[PDB]
Design an enzyme around this catalytic site. Structure first.
Site, short mmCIF file in Angstrom:
data_model
loop_
_atom_site.label_atom_id
_atom_site.label_comp_id
_atom_site.label_asym_id
_atom_site.label_seq_id
_atom_site.Cartn_x
_atom_site.Cartn_y
_atom_site.Cartn_z
N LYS A 43 -9.03 13.53 4.34
CA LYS A 43 -8.12 12.38 4.38
C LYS A 43 -7.22 12.60 5.59
CE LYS A 43 -5.64 13.30 0.57
NZ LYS A 43 -6.65 12.78 -0.40
N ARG A 44 -6.40 11.61 5.93
CA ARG A 44 -5.46 11.75 7.05
C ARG A 44 -4.48 12.90 6.86
NH1 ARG A 44 -4.12 10.57 10.59
NH2 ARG A 44 -4.22 8.72 11.94
N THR A 73 -8.29 6.36 -2.48
CA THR A 73 -9.65 5.86 -2.72
C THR A 73 -10.66 6.98 -2.49
OG1 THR A 73 -9.75 4.99 -0.46
CG2 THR A 73 -9.21 3.43 -2.22
N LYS A 113 -14.38 8.33 -4.60
CA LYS A 113 -15.64 8.68 -3.96
C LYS A 113 -16.15 10.03 -4.47
CE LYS A 113 -13.84 6.30 -0.04
NZ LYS A 113 -13.89 6.26 1.43
N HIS A 168 0.78 -1.24 0.00
CA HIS A 168 0.00 0.00 0.00
C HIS A 168 0.82 1.30 0.00
CE1 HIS A 168 -4.12 -1.62 0.47
NE2 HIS A 168 -3.53 -2.60 1.14
N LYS A 218 0.39 14.20 1.80
CA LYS A 218 -0.95 14.58 1.33
C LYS A 218 -0.99 16.06 0.99
CE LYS A 218 -3.00 10.74 3.19
NZ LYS A 218 -3.67 9.71 2.35
C1 LIG Z 1 -11.66 6.75 1.87
C2 LIG Z 1 -11.31 7.18 3.26
C3 LIG Z 1 -9.97 7.47 3.53
C4 LIG Z 1 -8.96 7.46 2.40
O1 LIG Z 1 -9.09 8.65 1.65
P1 LIG Z 1 -7.82 9.14 0.81
O2 LIG Z 1 -8.05 10.54 0.29
O3 LIG Z 1 -7.61 8.22 -0.37
O4 LIG Z 1 -6.62 9.16 1.71
C5 LIG Z 1 -9.60 7.93 4.78
N1 LIG Z 1 -10.56 8.10 5.74
C6 LIG Z 1 -11.89 7.82 5.50
C7 LIG Z 1 -12.92 8.02 6.58
C8 LIG Z 1 -12.29 7.36 4.25
O5 LIG Z 1 -13.63 7.09 4.05
#
Ligand SMILES: *Cc1c(COP(=O)(O)O)cnc(C)c1O
Ligand SMILES: O=C(CN1C(=O)[C@@H](NC(=O)c2cc3cc(Cl)sc3[nH]2)Cc2ccccc21)NCCO
Ligand SMILES: O=C(CN1C(=O)[C@@H](NC(=O)c2cc3cc(Cl)sc3[nH]2)Cc2ccccc21)NCCO
Ligand SMILES: *Cc1c(COP(=O)(O)O)cnc(C)c1O
EC number: 2.4.1.1
Lengths: 794, 796
Positions: A531-532, A639, A643, A341, A537
């Site tokens: 995201k985190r 991911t 979305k 990953h 990022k």
């Molecule tokens: C999808 C998801 C992530 C990952 O999002 P990224 O932008 O790809 O890092 C992290 N936290 C939550 C709650 C998510 O639903």
């Protein structure tokens, strides 16, 4: 009301109602004049879970009879979120329950807000496992997710005085109606001890922790399939002795809040073995109820966290089943496969040899044996290549000898996959190059995906419906059928409707913030980065653009700008100082921007508190602009990006991870691509990255760094953001400055399109229509045919 | 099959089978294909549980606005809940039929359920019988306590020695509790007292949440279901912070296995304040849903001194939070609170060091001293110039360590103080609380202990219950005085036969139990039973001396007939108590010689009954011929096991101690095997040497213990027992030995006369009526709480 959420028939509605009141009476021990809002949720929760029972029993009895090859998705993380709405959806009960609850005088969506998130994950890796579980059930695969039942999930984030505060995620406080304890399958897990060698080997004098399984149903989409997620909780096998039971039981206490980072915590290692030993024991039991073992068993390793499954299966076959080494190793490798990953080196698990010696002596022995035979192979294919051996070895040299768990995985897995095309190519060419040359056949790509049930039908029923109106409902489990929407890009009604559903969602999220917390402008571009919090990022790059926006308004106050509400959400690792500062920076920008009379409605910057699965479901359907701004080569796939694309947001992003393939599916003219490519990053790395060049050359960039440094955004403490400045100027591994110019110019182009509602919407349609590849149904199908050796069926 | 268990109505039986299958399917997620006996117990448990809910809701809604009675106890020795529920709802026969038609043995299902062993012994068992009686007498009564994650340790016997294992009673889930999240409350610890413009405030505390779980308490066929509310502890680098939550939550993890002893453990004090703070918060909320009427709406009964903090806590809430003046608050407090004492043994008394209270409960310590000053001012007024009286009554004890005496606290803050048996309540007035009785004679009462005839007769001895009801009907179940009608049947040939028949039946059932779970005993032997917690004051050691005497007498006269005996001793020792652990091993060590001597064989057996608990009592007590109740006079406040044996058809060999006196009085001293020193007689010593030299048989046994006859590989193992018996015996075992053996000869002589044995038993069973806990509770209600018990039924 909405056709996609199924039928609300008279007799079916009256049943739900009788069983609702039944549960309130007998299960919850309440009348209609004493029942709490929580009680009502639980009665519906139980009413719905009753409809799962029959199919669950039949599904697992169906696998026993057909005896197909079983998929075991092994993961320390299952970021599941809420379960009620998802269950209703997969069983077509949503409308009939909504009507049942309305008739009884209740708001079902209010009740849904009472359920706690199953926040048993950190981010992308963990939610992927959750999407996978959904897709594997929808595709009829004999699949089990195996993990840990953390008593406490990812910390609940509170924003106090602009800072992140961690509190315990007590999700099991009021009960979990969606789990079923299965203590008949309680199994012993062993720790420490020593190893005797006899005329085989014997692992003796161990400390035991019991592992107690709890099963949670995983319903497929309208196919009557219910699979299982099995999560293990730690169980101890005068007064101090009873309280000391806590120590053993602490193994399943709390999820490690480490996203993309490694520390050699002994408790972490105990967790990873705990899950490995119990699961594998459970797998072997099911198999017997070993040449054919890989014909009946697939174990997928979600990262290196369960890498111990490799020596642990070697330990069982050899020491306990009395199998020859070479045969056990053929069986082991054909069984296991490994999903990488991240290429970030600080995330790589390298355990101190000493720590493995004390805790898992037998496993250390087997690791050393695996390493000798494997290097004998490297030496035979590349004779005299001494430096290749030290590079490919599972044992790392240093004042602390370590085991590289990734190397263990590649050696013991028949399949090694990356998570997006670019990331998978990076693995062959760089990080695992030696391994690629030894066994090129092992290396695959499996681009990530997201489930269009939770991430479209569930969270955006209004969008699901307007799509359903045009192409039917078949797309929900065949997402490629979204391409039919391309024929509607000039449809006046669909353009109206797409815009209409977006505004509606934006109105709903604005109400949520008002009700639970803040007033946001419904008539502004919703600019979202969730995201985190990580340097890679680049939330910090978003920060520089926001201040650019601010300074541009101050320089020309009379000049119209497209009003934006900038939202940034995400948790920081409790020990991540820089990430904590970054959250503090975002709030502090907001402190100045949101209160400046000159700005007013033109610009708002808000930090979205406690970003988690249920919040994602709320905010992503309301986003206009999706921020996906990782530095090229850092985000393995992403991911969150998929979305946003599926829910009608346009994407501003770098050519990194799955952003590359998203841009390819939609066409680069419908994507706001910007910044360095991977090649351009290497060009800077090879020459050396000087961020001071950018400083001296870009006046607007200069202004912001002086604002940051001098104390403009921290008047009471002018010193506050000094570590951020110093890092950005002198130790930025992520070249925030190198992409600043392109980002701001590309954001101008975003604002230009938004000024034109029609062409914004038409570009939106072109994105939605081509999100099809990013269904986890597609991802799972590839895993199944290309790694697992099974065929999906809907 | 049998009448006393109700009707197996065809319609109920059909709906019972349907709900059984429903629950197996939906609640348990199982088919008859993979279902284990445990699944089947839980399916039944849920089916029966369902029948409680309607009554349970309707009862609490009905609560008419009566006065509410709050029984506060650190211990509730409940046992199992399945059978007890079926008896009170009259569903036992209907469920036996239902499971039968489903191919299941209902009694095998009942054996799966774990005891709720949230008590040590009598004290805790008393609370449990009390909850049942209070439901049957229709009182708006709540039991308040702690939900220990681990109850009283499960005892295993390994090598003849007591092993302790954790009582993981919650392991497979508890169907008989209902979590009540809406009523979670903050309990505060440590912190400091600061002073504002309006009064004192307790600030900067550590918070532990208190999570209430409710257990239904059904009444016998009156449609009333009351509540026992049990509180569980919950917490309000990052990893270590989450792990350290265990620390607060440890408060409700384990029951302290001290029985007759006081350990000044800080975790124990935390348990005590935990239950008290949450309970009082709960009590006041229901009152609100003026504090002058608080005493007419609330009674708080303090089971021993364990919940004594309730006094300063009620004062605290009334003064610091509700803003009443001290004097008015004090009036409310005393009128609300009442204290029950359970022992006079000095080591049992709670005396918390002032230093510990100051740190953990700084505000309560202040209030304690304020209570003390106002109480002692009082004493000085009534008895002016009695300085010694002042130091003797003070809540504060002087010494190298200053301590608060909690019993003095309780009396000071209670409007009633009671003992648990006539003799004990009198010795309270005359010795240990003599000065408090002299100040306030109106406060001191008696409430003789009781046991529930439901659990302790209809449930554990259905055969006895049935032959009784065949003569006098079923009215006796909730009106135990009616057993006196059986006095008329003392010359009746059929009743004598029937009483003997049911006892032999019970003895066969227990003999099958022992063979099944642990293997042999001879069913045609006298069942000589001593079951209770292990302690010197109980004198399991006197039993050992008689057992050895009986063994030696057969070895000297091998051809002489002796009435065959199976001597069973059961009970747990406190894990620290070294002397109690030695006693248990001495019992097994004797057994090891006697049970393997070919000259003895089936004539005498000595067995240690492993893991004595409520469920085991229900098994052995119906089977006993002789109830051993041999405590040194003055030491056992009441006893309750004694009453169970009486109602179940055992004869009693005992001293005139505790409730033994009143038992003998009810039945007539002719019908009892009374021996040994009375209290008066004990007060004329406290030299055991005098007995040893004058009695050659006693001598021989003490030579066997010290020289290593009962421990060959460990010659000196019982040196500590010998030395203590000879020199340091606080319980004059040697003094009653002679009367004990001779009285035991008259037991055997009667036993070899089966008709006259049974006739005396009849006279015993028929006069056991007073020792119903319904009689005890009626008294509490009338003489302390000020409420009227009623056996009135509720609708549906
Ligand atoms: C999808 C998801 C992530 C990952 O999002 P990224 O932008 O790809 O890092 C992290 N936290 C939550 C709650 C998510 O639903
Ligand atoms: O075996 C049991 C029996 N049991 C349940 O199965 C339990 N049932 C479930 O939790 C459950 C049922 C269903 C149906 C589902 Cl679909 S998910 C799910 N979970 C109900 C229960 C209540 C009180 C005591 C025991 C149980 N419990 C072990 C718990 O440690
Ligand atoms: O199966 C359940 C269902 N369940 C209850 O038993 C349910 N109620 C009871 O525990 C309960 C009910 C009744 C009726 C009684 Cl009479 S005593 C008693 N206790 C509350 C609940 C809340 C949240 C999730 C599940 C439940 N729980 C097993 C634990 O996971
Ligand atoms: C009643 C009982 C006791 C108390 O018995 P005594 O002989 O009065 O001490 C102790 N434990 C259990 C399990 C009981 O049922």
């Amino acid at each position: 009301q909405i056709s996609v959420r199924g039928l609300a028939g008279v007799e079916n509605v009256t049943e739900l109602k009788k069983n609702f009141n039944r549960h309130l009476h007998f299960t919850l021990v309440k009348d209609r004049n004493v029942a709490t809002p929580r009680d009502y949720y639980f009665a519906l929760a139980h009413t719905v879970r009753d409809h799962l029972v029959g199919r669950w029993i039949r599904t697992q009895q169906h696998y026993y009879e057909k005896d197909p090859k079983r998929i075991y998705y092994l993961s320390l993380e299952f970021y599941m979120g809420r379960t009620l709405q998802n269950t209703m959806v997969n069983l077509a009960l949503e409308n009939a329950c909504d009507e049942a609850t309305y008739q009884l005088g209740l708001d079902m969506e209010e009740l849904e807000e009472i359920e706690e998130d199953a926040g048993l994950g950190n981010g992308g890796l963990g939610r992927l496992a959750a999407c996978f579980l959904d897709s594997m059930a929808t595709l009829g695969l004999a699949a089990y997710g195996y993990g840990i039942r953390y008593e406490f999930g990812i910390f609940n984030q509170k924003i106090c005085g602009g800072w992140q505060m961690e509190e315990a995620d007590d999700w099991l406080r009021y009960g979990n109606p969606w789990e079923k304890a299965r203590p008949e399958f309680t199994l012993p897990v062993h720790f420490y001890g020593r190893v005797e060698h006899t005329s085989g080997a014997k692992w003796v004098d161990t400390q035991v922790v019991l592992a107690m399984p709890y099963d949670t149903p995983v319903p497929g989409y309208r196919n009557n399939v219910v699979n299982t997620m099995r999560l293990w909780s730690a169980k101890a096998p005068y007064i101090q002795a009873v309280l000391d039971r806590n120590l053993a039981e602490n193994i399943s206490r709390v999820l490690y809040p480490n996203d993309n980072f490694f520390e050699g915590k002994e408790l972490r290692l105990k967790q990873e073995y705990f899950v490995v030993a119990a699961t594998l024991q459970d797998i072997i039991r099911r198999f017997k109820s070993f040449d054919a073992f890989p014909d009946k068993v697939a174990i997928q390793l979600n990262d290196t966290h369960p890498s111990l499954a490799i020596p642990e299966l070697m330990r069982v076959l050899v020491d306990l089943e009395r199998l020859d080494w070479d045969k056990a190793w053929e069986v082991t490798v054909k069984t296991c496969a490994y999903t990488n990953h991240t290429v970030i080196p600080e995330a790589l698990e390298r355990w101190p040899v000493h720590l493995l010696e004390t805790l898992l002596p037998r496993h250390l022995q087997i690791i050393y044996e695996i390493n000798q035979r494997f290097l004998n192979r490297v030496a035979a294919a590349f004779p005299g290549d001494v430096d290749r051996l030290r590079r490919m070895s599972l044992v790392e040299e240093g004042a602390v000898k370590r085991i590289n768990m990734a190397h263990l995985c590649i050696a013991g897995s028949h399949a090694v996959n990356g998570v997006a095309r670019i990331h998978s190519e990076i693995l062959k060419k760089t990080i695992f190059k030696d391994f690629y040359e030894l066994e090129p056949h092992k290396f695959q790509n499996k681009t990530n995906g997201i489930t269009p049930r939770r991430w479209l039908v569930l969270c955006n029923p209004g969008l699901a419906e307007i799509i359903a109106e045009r192409i039917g409902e078949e797309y929900i489990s065949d997402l490629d059928q979204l391409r039919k929407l391309l024929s509607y890009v000039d449809d006046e009604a669909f353009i109206r409707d797409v815009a209409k559903v977006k505004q509606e969602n934006k109105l709903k999220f604005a109400a949520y913030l008002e009700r639970e917390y803040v007033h946001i402008n419904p008539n502004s571009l919703f600019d979202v980065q969730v995201k985190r919090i990580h340097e890679y990022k680049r939330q910090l790059l978003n920060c520089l653009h926001v201040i650019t926006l601010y300074n541009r308004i101050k320089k020309e106050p009379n000049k119209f700008v497209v009003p934006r509400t900038v939202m940034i959400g995400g948790k920081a690792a409790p020990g991540y100082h820089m990430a904590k500062m970054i959250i503090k920076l975002i709030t502090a920008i907001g402190d100045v921007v949101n209160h400046d009379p000159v700005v007013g409605d033109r610009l708002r910057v808000i930090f979205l508190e406690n970003y988690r699965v249920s919040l994602a479901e709320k905010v992503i359907p309301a986003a206009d602009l999706s921020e996906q701004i990782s530095t090229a080569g850092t985000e393995a796939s992403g991911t969150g990006n998929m979305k946003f694309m599926l829910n009608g947001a346009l994407t501003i992003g770098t050519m990194d991870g799955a952003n590359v393939e998203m841009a390819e599916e939609a066409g680069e003219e419908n994507f706001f691509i910007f910044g360095m490519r991977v090649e351009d990053v290497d060009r800077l790395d090879q020459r050396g990255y000087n961020a001071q060049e950018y400083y001296d050359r870009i006046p607007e960039l200069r202004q912001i760094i002086e604002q940051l440094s001098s104390g403009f955004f921290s008047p009471k403490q002018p010193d506050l953001f000094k570590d951020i400045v110093n890092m950005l100027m002198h130790h930025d591994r992520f070249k925030v400055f190198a992409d600043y110019e392109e980002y701001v110019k590309c954001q101008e182009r975003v604002s230009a399109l938004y000024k034109n509602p029609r062409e914004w919407t038409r570009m939106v349609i072109r994105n939605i229509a081509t999100s099809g590849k990013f269904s986890s149904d597609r991802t799972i199908a590839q895993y199944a045919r290309e790694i697992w050796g099974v065929e999906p069926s809907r």
